[PDB]
Amino acid sequence: SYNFPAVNQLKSSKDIPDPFIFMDGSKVESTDDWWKRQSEISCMYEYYMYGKWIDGSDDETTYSISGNSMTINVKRKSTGKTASFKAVINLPKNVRHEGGAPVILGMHKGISESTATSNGYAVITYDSDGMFSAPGTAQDNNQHKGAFYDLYPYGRNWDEQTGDLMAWSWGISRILDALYNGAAKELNINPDSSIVTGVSRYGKAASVCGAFDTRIKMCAPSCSGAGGLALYRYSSVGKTYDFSSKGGSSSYTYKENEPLGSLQASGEQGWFNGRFMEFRNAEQFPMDQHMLGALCCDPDRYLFIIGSCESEDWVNAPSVWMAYLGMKHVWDYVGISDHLAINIHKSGHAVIAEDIEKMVQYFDYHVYGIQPKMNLEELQTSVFALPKNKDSFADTFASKWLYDPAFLY
């Protein structure tokens, strides 16, 4: 449903919104109520932030493979229009999972592909470097040009506006369609064992992709920052942390975090929808990004958050950590606490080798029953949980929520 108030009619609050309160003020009182609230949250994100999700109901996908180059061809059934875009295949030399290799679907090249393939996982990414060459589905700008927009033009009404993050997500869905439609058998991939990942602006994209294409088994957004998984309402500027347990500095003080106006600037607004430009303060959002993450909460799915302690203060890892703490309430309420994971590594604005290694051990355990070598409890905490690094905010932000049981964190 999209019968939502205009932005200028929204109440403002500094509190982190309760995921368990519906827009109309009614309460989640059962897990069945949660599934309904999750659907509402999904619609709210379309309406206020990312644009209309295009779910593939109108798309017919075919493909071709030449060496490691994959061409994805899409026809929009109602209009007859066609578009195409390119992806890159990386297969493991040895498949070790019955039913085919798991597949990491990447928003761009350069996500530690060789670590994945050495561990038996396939990787298919857009033929994009994550910077100068954007995915073929949409150029990285505010003019909305590319294979997605050739089929779904960016128009004047809100339902006609789908931002670049959703355009990039749509192409991942079409790659997955091609896999189910024959490509997975050709490549010795299990298309049900799917992961989506990407970094920075493409980490925002990966979060959106997992939230909206619920077929993808694990969502793994890296260093996604503002408009990704960071809380809009939590600032870490001027806070000091001890990162020595991770090999970092024993007294590291964060500089600036990205603020709302930076997301609304010409170089970033294309990622969002037109309605997003109406917001003036973070306190106006009828959500915060723990709720975007919670769109991936499901008994058959997993969310694996990646971020960094040092050298990327703008993407606000402490606020991503706070959002993760909020998400823990939802995953615990549904009874699947271990389906939520987080790796705050020392540094690297990237998906680095240890991220892949830990993703593989985690996914192998939950999806295949393979016992891990590592202690998976390490993915259920971070350096921000050390008492000396704790903000009192962590213990109070959820205190008004309907579900705030003791000892979640």
Residue numbers in the entry: 366 to 774
From the paper:
GEs share an invariant Ser-His-Glu/Asp catalytic triad and employ a conserved catalytic mechanism that involves the formation of an acyl-enzyme covalent intermediate, which is subsequently cleaved through acid-base hydrolysis. Rumen GEs adopt a canonical α/β hydrolase fold: FsCE15, PrCE15, and RfCE15 adopted the canonical α/β-hydrolase fold that is seen in all of the GE structures solved to date. The fold of all three enzymes consists of a central twisted 10 stranded mixed β-sheet flanked by α-helices on either side.
RfCE15 is the C-terminal GE domain of a multi-modular enzyme from R. flavefaciens called CesA. The structure of RfCE15 was refined to Rwork/Rfree of 16.8%/19.0% using data with a maximum resolution of 1.25 Å. The catalytic residues of RfCE15 are observed in a non-canonical configuration, with the putative general acid Glu677 located on a loop at the end of β8; making RfCE15 a member of the CE15-A GE subfamily. The general base (His714) is located on a loop directly above the catalytic serine, but is shifted by 2.2 Å relative to the position of this loop in FsCE15 and PrCE15. The shift in this position accommodates the non-canonical conformation of the general acid residue. Despite the shift in Cα of His714, the imidazole ring occupies a similar location as that found in the other GEs, with His714 Nε2 making a 2.8 Å hydrogen bond with Oγ of Ser565, and a 2.9 Å bidentate hydrogen bond with the carboxyl functional group of Glu677. Most notably, a 16 amino acid insertion from residues Gly603-Tyr619 forms an extended Ω-loop that wraps around the backside of the general base loop. As observed in other CE15-A subfamily GEs, the conserved disulfide bond found in CE15-B GEs, was not observed in RfCE15. Instead, these residues are Val564 and Val715 and form a hydrophobic pocket that is composed of an extended network of Van der Waals interactions between Ile114, Ile121, Met228, Phe314, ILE316, Ile366, and Met369. In contrast, the addition of reducing agent to RfCE15 did not alter its thermal stability, an observation consistent with the lack of disulfide bonds.
